[PDB]
């Protein structure tokens, strides 16, 4: 699977995974710069602990980086 | 800890552009963002805009708006500001500075921009405008 | 159009008493307000992050508050050495601008 990679935020071929992921936080700067975005690849969609989100997908770069709607 | 080396003094006609360059040696950017202030002889400091190297967005102050072009060349850690139409309240120095707050770190990245404090500043060009 | 802080041009304090810097703006306390210093022919320092935090090897005397319409550097037991130039700055947001306030020199008396 092809997915988007965090820090890069470029699309990179994953030959041994099959899902992407978009992990997302907020740290101690949430409320300025947005939550955190950890964009990824994995052979199954990863686990997360309390207080984090994690959305999984199974088609080419279908994890784009979600920016935050300006209003 | 990372610096900013830009360069040299420019003297400049009215009615033409300048370029100039600055290089964040001791290290690199990417995931920190880039800001130019210039100080009038005298005068207050005074945004010009900066880039977000990492989303391609650069943001401008309106009073140099469509005169004023900032860039990054990520390959050599060099961020640019190109002032054009130049006049005489140009003349001042001009600085780059880095926004303290990195927008990636440890396999992720933040989701809006929001120019933090700036920490390391370069040294500043002398940039005058006369005939 | 953009955001506007206002200092007061000039401060002056006698030595070892208590500087005080305002930098007033419509509800500044929604703003996050940094704060530098500079001295003549050199680069602008950081002194005050975030309304109150003092950068790595900043002295403690410089404090800094933020509340309602004013924002305020407080430099405690003033010293010859920090007469020089203070700026207040914000990002405002509505207006995806950097603002620098005017500035204040900070003179300390004989």
């Known amino acids: 699977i092809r997915c988007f990679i965090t820090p890069d935020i470029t699309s990179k071929d994953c030959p041994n995974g099959h899902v992407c992921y978009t992990k997302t936080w907020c740290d101690a700067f949430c409320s300025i710069r947005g939550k955190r975005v950890d964009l990824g690849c994995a052979a199954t969609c990863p686990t997360v602990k309390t207080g984090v989100d994690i959305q999984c997908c199974s088609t080419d770069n279908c994890n784009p980086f979600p920016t935050r709607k300006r209003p | 800890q990372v610096q900013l080396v830009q360069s040299g003094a420019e003297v400049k006609k009215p009615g033409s552009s300048v370029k100039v360059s600055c290089k964040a040696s001791?290290?690199?950017?990417?995931?920190?963002?880039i800001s130019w202030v210039r100080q009038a002889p005298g005068q207050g400091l005074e945004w010009m805009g900066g880039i977000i190297p990492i989303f391609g967005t650069a943001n401008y102050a309106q009073k140099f708006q469509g005169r004023v072009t900032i860039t990054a060349d990520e390959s050599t850690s060099t961020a640019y500001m190109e002032l054009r139409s130049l006049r005489s309240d140009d003349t001042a120095v001009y600085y780059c500075?880095?926004?303290?707050?990195?927008?990636?770190?440890?396999?992720?990245?933040?989701?809006?921009?929001?120019?933090?404090?700036?920490?390391?500043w370069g040294q500043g060009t002398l940039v005058t405008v006369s005939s | 159009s953009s955001y506007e802080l206002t200092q007061p041009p000039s401060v002056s304090v006698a030595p070892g008493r208590t500087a005080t810097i305002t930098c007033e703006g419509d509800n500044i306390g929604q703003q996050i307000v940094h704060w530098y210093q500079q001295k003549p022919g050199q680069a602008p320092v950081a002194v005050i992050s975030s309304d109150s935090d003092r950068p790595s090897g900043i002295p403690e005397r410089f404090s800094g508050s933020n509340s309602g319409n004013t924002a305020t550097l407080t430099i405690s037991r003033v010293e010859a050495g920090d007469e020089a130039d203070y700026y207040c700055?914000?990002?405002?947001?509505?207006?995806?601008?950097?603002?620098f306030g005017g500035g204040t020199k900070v003179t300390v008396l004989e």
């Open positions: 500075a880095r926004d303290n707050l990195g927008y990636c770190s440890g396999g992720s990245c933040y989701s809006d921009y929001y120019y933090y404090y700036m920490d390391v």
């Open positions: 001791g290290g690199t950017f990417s995931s920190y963002a």
């Open positions: 700055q914000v990002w405002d947001s509505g207006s995806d601008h950097v603002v």
